């Protein structure tokens, strides 16, 4: 499996696009609510401020976190290799098989 650092990096990226999807959804609801606000019912007027504020705060911190990720790219620089040992490990397992062949009491 990959080293953990890459794991939380990909988790943060996934959070980033989920936040972008949430921003698009909230844009959909604010566009929806503005229609009836133009229609002329004032009951949903208080919800408009909350929706706008949450939309803007969702737009800002997502870009901020992505900026942090791109910054991490800046200092992460400088921080078949398996083949060099690959034959060796193959060697090992083959002899292990011979051991299983060599002992008739373990072939069950």
């Amino acid at each position: 499996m990959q080293p953990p650092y890459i794991q939380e990096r990909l988790k943060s990226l996934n959070d980033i696009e989920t936040q972008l999807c949430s921003m698009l959804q909230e844009a959909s609801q604010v566009t929806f609510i503005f229609g009836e606000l133009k229609r002329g019912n004032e009951s949903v007027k208080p919800q408009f401020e909350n929706h706008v504020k949450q939309f803007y705060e969702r737009l800002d911190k997502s870009t901020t976190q992505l900026r942090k990720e791109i910054q991490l790219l800046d200092e992460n620089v400088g921080t078949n290799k398996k083949a060099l040992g690959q034959d060796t490990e193959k060697m090992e397992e083959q002899l292990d098989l011979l051991s299983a062949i060599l002992d008739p009491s373990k072939s069950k």
Partner: protein, 49 residues
């Protein structure tokens, strides 16, 4: 081929005397079509989203 072209010549006609009659209705009905455009704007944006 239809005709030798000299067709359009400049001419003068006076502007019609204004009143309350037609501008207020023109602008409120423009308000109407733009409220329409807002409605289809919201609908198209909702469908796209």
């Amino acid at each position: 081929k239809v005709v030798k072209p000299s067709s359009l010549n400049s001419d003068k006609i006076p502007y019609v005397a204004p009143t309350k009659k037609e501008y207020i209705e023109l602008d409120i009905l423009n308000k109407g079509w733009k409220l329409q455009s807002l409605n289809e704007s919201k609908d198209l944006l909702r469908a796209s989203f």
